Each structure stands twice: as C-alpha cells, then as structure tokens.
Symmetry: C5
Subunit: 114 residues, 5 copies
Amino acid sequence: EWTGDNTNAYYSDEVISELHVGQIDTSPYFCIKTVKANGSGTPVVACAVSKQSIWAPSFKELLDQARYFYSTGQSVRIHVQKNIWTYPLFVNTFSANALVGLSSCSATQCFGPK
Amino acid sequence: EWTGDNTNAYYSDEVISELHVGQIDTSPYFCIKTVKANGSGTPVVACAVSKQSIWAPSFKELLDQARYFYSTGQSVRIHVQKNIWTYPLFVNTFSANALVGLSSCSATQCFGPK
Amino acid sequence: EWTGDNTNAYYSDEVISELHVGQIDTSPYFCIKTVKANGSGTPVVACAVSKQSIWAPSFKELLDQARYFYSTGQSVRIHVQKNIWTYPLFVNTFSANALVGLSSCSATQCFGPK
Amino acid sequence: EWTGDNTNAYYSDEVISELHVGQIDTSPYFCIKTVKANGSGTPVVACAVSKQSIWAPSFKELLDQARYFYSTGQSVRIHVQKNIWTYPLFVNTFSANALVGLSSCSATQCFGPK
Amino acid sequence: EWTGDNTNAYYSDEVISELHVGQIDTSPYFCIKTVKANGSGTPVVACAVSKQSIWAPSFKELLDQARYFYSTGQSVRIHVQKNIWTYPLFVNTFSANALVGLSSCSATQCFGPK
Ligand SMILES: CC(=O)N[C@@H]1[C@@H](O)[C@H](O[C@@H]2O[C@H](CO)[C@H](O)[C@H](O[C@]3(C(=O)O)C[C@H](O)[C@@H](NC(C)=O)[C@H]([C@H](O)[C@H](O)COC(C)=O)O3)[C@H]2O)[C@@H](CO)O[C@H]1O
Ligand SMILES: CC(=O)N[C@@H]1[C@@H](O)[C@H](O[C@@H]2O[C@H](CO)[C@H](O)[C@H](O[C@]3(C(=O)O)C[C@H](O)[C@@H](NC(C)=O)[C@H]([C@H](O)[C@H](O)COC(C)=O)O3)[C@H]2O)[C@@H](CO)O[C@H]1O
Ligand SMILES: CC(=O)N[C@@H]1[C@@H](O)[C@H](O[C@@H]2O[C@H](CO)[C@H](O)[C@H](O[C@]3(C(=O)O)C[C@H](O)[C@@H](NC(C)=O)[C@H]([C@H](O)[C@H](O)COC(C)=O)O3)[C@H]2O)[C@@H](CO)O[C@H]1O
Ligand SMILES: CC(=O)N[C@@H]1[C@@H](O)[C@H](O[C@@H]2O[C@H](CO)[C@H](O)[C@H](O[C@]3(C(=O)O)C[C@H](O)[C@@H](NC(C)=O)[C@H]([C@H](O)[C@H](O)COC(C)=O)O3)[C@H]2O)[C@@H](CO)O[C@H]1O
Ligand SMILES: CC(=O)N[C@@H]1[C@@H](O)[C@H](O[C@@H]2O[C@H](CO)[C@H](O)[C@H](O[C@]3(C(=O)O)C[C@H](O)[C@@H](NC(C)=O)[C@H]([C@H](O)[C@H](O)COC(C)=O)O3)[C@H]2O)[C@@H](CO)O[C@H]1O
C-alpha cells in the first residue's frame, strides 16, 4: 500500500486548524482538523491511532509532521483513507478518516501524490 | 477505555501554566497545572506516570503535547480520569487525576470529545 | 558505503522548498524538493524510506535534519544515490533518488563530501 | 523513591545558566548550572547520567526538560539528591548532585514538592 | 574514560558554524565545524559515528546538543579526542576528531572540564 493510491482521498490547500491527542483501547492517537486556506469548502477531520489500521507504522512520523505543519500554519495537502475507524462515539466526535499523508503546497502546486 | 469516555472529566478553555517532571517508583512522570484562560475558576492539576495506570502507553505523546501547549500558552481542553494516583504525598502535592487527553480549543469550540 | 562515495550525486546551494511525509509498503517515508537558491537549474527530489535501502539506518536523522534545514530555508548541499526506489508510480510522483546526506553551506563552501 | 522525598533537596527561583553534555565510563551525561534569578545565593550544579543511579529511568525526560527550561530561561525549581556521583574529577568539575526533578515557577508558588 | 580526560583536547569560545549528517558503514554519523567567536584561530572539525569508537553511547545526546547549539549560535567549548577516525576519504573531508562533549560558555568561563 501507498499514500498515493487512488483508493485514498486528499484535499489541497488546507491549513491544520485544530489538534487533539488522546488514548483509545491501549493505543495513543491524535486527530487534526483542517480548513481551506481560502475560507471555502467544509472541514476535514482525520486521525491516526498508533497500533491500528494499516497506517499504524506511520503514527509517530504523521504526528510529528502534523505538529510541525500545525505550528507554521502553511498551505498543505492532506491525505486520508475513508471509513477506517469504527468506534461510533469516536467517529462521532472526530470522523472515520485515517491520516495517511501530508504534503506542503506552494500557491501553484502541491508536493504529493495526485 | 477512551479519552472521550463519560467516566472521565474535562475542563474547557484552560491554558497550561505549570509543568514539572520527576520520577516515582522507577518511573518517569510529569504533572501540569491549568488555569482558566480568563483566570477565574479553580486550577486543574493532572499527571501521567510512564509505567502506571491504563494510560501509560500514551505517556510520551501526552508529555510532548503538554509541552507544546505549555509553550504556546494557547487555550485547550484538558481531560483527566480522577482518583487514579494513590501515593498520598504525591496526591497531596499534585492530584489523583490521570491526564488522558489534550485538545486544542478555538474561540468557537474545542476539538475533542464532549 | 558512505554518503561521499563518488558513486553518489550531490547538489550544492539548494533550498529545501517542499516536504511530504507518507507511508509506502509498511514503511513511513518522507521526500523533499530542493530548489536552487535563485531559480536556476532544475529541482531535485529525494526520498528516505524507513527500513528500506542500505540507507535505512539514517532515516530518522535525515528526517529531523531535513525538518530543520526546511524550517530555516538556509543553503544546503543535498546528497543522493540515484536509481534506488523502483516503484514506477512513486518514482514518477517523486524520484528514484535516495537521500543519503545533508550539509550546511557558507557563502563559499558547503560542509561535506565533494 | 521519589523526587519529592524529604531526603532530597531543592532550590526555588533558579534559572538554568549553563548546560553541558558529555560521557563518563560508558554513559552519556549532562550537567546544568543554576543561579537565582535575583543574583542571590551560590550557583547549583546538578547532573544526570544515563544507566547510572536510581534516577537513571528519568534521564531523557529530565534532559528534554532541562534543555527546554534552558532555552526559555524561566524561573524554575531544581530538585536534586546530593552525594550520588563519586568520580572525583567529575564532581570537582560539576558536583555530586544528581538531578531528580524540574519544576516550573510562576507568580505564585513553584509547581512541585515543597 | 571521560570527556574531560587530559588525553582529550578542547577549544573554548567557539561557535558551531556548520552541521552535516550522513551515513557510513551502516552507521549514521554527523560532523560539525567550529570557529572562534572572535574570528581568531583555525576551525575545528569533529564527528560522531553511531556504531564505533568508545564515544558511541553518547552519539544521540551529542547530535541533539550540537543541533541546539548550532541553532542558537551561542559560544561553546568543544571537546574532542584526536586521531579516532581512520578512513582516509572521510578524514580528508572532515577530521579524525571524535566529538566527546559540549559546554555552554559565558563571556568569562565555560561550564565544563578544563
Ligand atoms: C479558478 C477557480 O475558480 N478554482 C476553484 C477551486 O476552489 C477548486 O479547485 C481546487 O483547487 C485545485 C484545482 O483548482 C485542486 O484541484 C482541488 O481539487 C481537489 C484537491 O483538494 O486537490 C481534488 C481532490 O481529489 C478532491 N478530494 C476529494 C475527496 O474529492 C478535493 C475536494 O473535492 C475539495 O478540496 C473539497 O474538499 C472539501 C472537504 O471541501 O479537491 C480543488 O479543490 C474547484 C473545485 O472543483 O472549484 C473552483 O471554482
Ligand atoms: C466486507 C465485510 O463486511 N467483511 C467482514 C467484516 O465486516 C467483519 O468485521 C470485523 O469483525 C471483527 C470481529 O469483531 C472486528 O470487530 C472488526 O472491528 C474492529 C476490530 O476488532 O478490528 C473492532 C474494534 O473495536 C475496532 N477498534 C476501534 C478503536 O475502533 C477495530 C478498529 O476500528 C480497526 O482495527 C481499525 O480500523 C480498521 C477497519 O482496520 O475494528 C470488524 O471490522 C470481519 C469479521 O467480523 O470480516 C468479514 O467477515
Ligand atoms: C491500602 C492498599 O494498599 N490497598 C491495596 C489496593 O488499593 C491495591 O491496588 C493498589 O492501590 C494502592 C493504593 O490504594 C496502590 O496504588 C497500589 O500500588 C501502586 C503501584 O506502585 O502500582 C503504588 C503507587 O504509590 C502508586 N503510584 C502513585 C503515583 O500514586 C500506584 C499507582 O497509583 C497505580 O497506577 C494504581 O492506580 C490505578 C487506579 O491504577 O499504585 C495499587 O496496586 C490492591 C493491589 O495492590 O490491593 C491492596 O493491597
Ligand atoms: C534567609 C532568607 O533567605 N530570607 C528571605 C527569604 O524569605 C527568601 O528565601 C528563600 O525564598 C524562596 C521563595 O521564593 C524559598 O522559600 C527559599 O526556601 C528554599 C527553596 O529554595 O525552596 C527551601 C529549600 O529547602 C532550600 N534548599 C536546601 C538544600 O536547603 C533552599 C535553599 O536554602 C536556598 O534556595 C538557597 O540555596 C542556594 C544554593 O542558594 O531555600 C527561601 O530560602 C527570599 C525572599 O526574598 O530571600 C530572603 O529575603
Ligand atoms: C578580547 C579579545 O579580543 N580576545 C580574547 C582572547 O584573548 C581569547 O583567547 C582565548 O582565551 C581563553 C580564556 O582565557 C583561552 O585562553 C583560550 O585558550 C584555549 C581554549 O580554547 O580553551 C586553551 C586550550 O587548551 C587550547 N586547546 C589546545 C588543544 O591546545 C585552545 C587552542 O589552542 C585554541 O582554541 C586555538 O585552536 C585553534 C585550532 O584555533 O585555546 C584562548 O583561545 C578569546 C577566545 O579565543 O576571547 C577573548 O577573551
């Protein structure tokens, strides 16, 4: 598997606006919120939980890269795979998206799979 | 278990104002204090111990997040599980609360379980 | 093997312009895009992939160093080994270049092999 | 054992003046120096040594926390256990104080065992 | 062995001018160049190789301490042991000096072995 599989969803020109970290089922997890840098669209919520999903190996690098991007506030493309999380109250608070990639976006192009 | 369980407590629009690191019983641990962004209400102290309680496997993420929210001074929702730590002079100095989550807060809302 | 083997290629006076982090084939990975400080020449793309290639041991060090040199926008020499990644989609989204070294530069020389 | 044990000694309103990193008999170590924020008293020196003494599990948590309080220069409470390091030249260079905790100090009381 | 053995060599009031990360013989390594803050004297180049020499255990501590001092630009004392590294293409580019510790320096004194 790869972040750039067309079986994943991505969203260009996003700013990570909120950040949460917590625990579920003996696993640490974090979620981010992103909103469009130009005020449009609707927000995207994605999580990563450290020992679940096929994306578990990525957890610490994702979290670290989320934390960095969140602090600079730059334009980023956000990559997810839908319909991964299953605890109903959890997906209610956040969503069922699994974070799978982050790409910095210039004003013209983004630096990730497309 | 889950950070967002209803058996836990949360306190919104807090800002982390104190941070302390030590060791207890061969265990790294940290403690934070939080005060209302407006300065009213009663402070919240919560603690994480790296080898103890169901919440140990998230020790370092929570430390890393508590540190980041500590430096920015931003307003956050802090989540605890009360009546966890039992060494009475530890508890007297700090709390019986286990830290189990940290969410960023917008002025709108906070990005965490309710 | 060594970063400064003549079987490797390097590009001085570059600026890490873009950063992407993702997961491929159970490995967390990152790529960078470096531009000549002025606008000259063609960009170079280079990836490091946890647990993959002979350069795997250096993954975390090159990821932290890249994060730094990218936060500063300072001049660097970037060292690569060509034709390492073989997945044609990944190679077309990025490059086959394995990142193998990163050097700061002053106004005259860069601090690394050449 | 605990940072807060009355058999341990501590110092309020310190600022981490210096920071040093080295190795001694197999172990990475670091030493800090603190002086009172008002100029009073005499400097405190404290060291932590990896894989050595009962405080060894805290080495990296304590180093990260020492680095951070160093970078900010904020007022802190340093907790130590005295007479731990015996290496005569090392102690004459720094001290035999083993670093057992770090506490933030704000307008009101220092956040830690008192 | 100890950073401050008089069989080692040190230079005070230096600034970390350049940083390089790379890999050699399956081992991440890094090197630094230091110049007198007053401009006097000749640079010192020192390196740490994560798998080799008796200073291996402190590889990561020194890496983290070098990166911090390099980012503040503050004056330091660098300690090295001469004539450690043997591979001539490596020593010709950098040095045979192994990095063995780092101290922060006042305008009057350095906090470390003399
Ligand atoms: C000139 C003009 O008027 N352009 C606007 C645009 O606002 C908008 O185009 C956006 O910018 C780029 C190209 O113009 C990108 O292609 C965007 O396309 C994607 C993206 O984010 O990269 C493609 C991606 O596959 C889509 N993701 C999914 C799951 O379908 C997303 C997504 O559809 C949007 O970002 C919306 O996301 C949310 C949650 O709101 O877009 C593109 O957004 C263009 C859109 O058609 O409308 C023009 O008017
Ligand atoms: C197409 C199809 O329907 N195939 C079916 C599956 O629907 C079916 O579903 C799985 O059954 C398992 C047996 O209980 C599990 O319950 C699966 O859900 C869990 C899991 O254990 O893996 C339940 C668990 O509570 C979840 N944890 C959290 C924090 O939410 C996990 C977790 O969500 C996932 O591990 C991570 O996300 C994913 C999707 O990877 O999901 C359940 O899906 C299964 C047999 O019952 O196989 C086919 O028969
Ligand atoms: C009077 C008495 O000891 N009764 C106990 C039961 O309570 C006991 O479960 C224990 O509760 C104790 C206090 O009532 C201690 O918490 C026990 O051990 C420690 C531990 O080391 O694990 C002691 C230690 O002081 C505690 N650390 C701190 C910072 O307070 C820890 C820590 O609190 C643990 O995480 C427990 O907290 C929770 C809710 O998980 O507990 C603890 O075992 C039971 C078996 O011990 O039967 C009686 O002996
Ligand atoms: C005699 C005197 O000091 N008079 C006043 C004091 O009111 C006050 O002195 C210090 O004020 C601090 C509060 O900000 C602390 O209360 C000091 O108590 C401690 C401390 O640092 O917490 C208590 C601690 O137990 C002591 N540690 C040890 C090993 O004994 C330390 C220590 O004695 C001092 O920090 C000095 O140590 C060194 C190396 O310098 O003190 C309290 O003493 C302060 C208010 O203005 O100054 C005087 O005016
Ligand atoms: C006011 C002004 O313009 N300049 C002064 C200088 O006089 C001063 O020079 C330094 O003064 C220091 C404190 O007095 C030390 O004496 C320095 O000597 C050492 C050192 O770095 O610690 C002593 C040390 O033992 C020597 N190391 C070895 C292996 O011999 C080194 C070494 O010789 C030098 O660093 C030169 O090395 C190279 C390759 O360049 O010197 C002394 O340098 C100045 C700081 O340089 O700051 C002002 O106070």
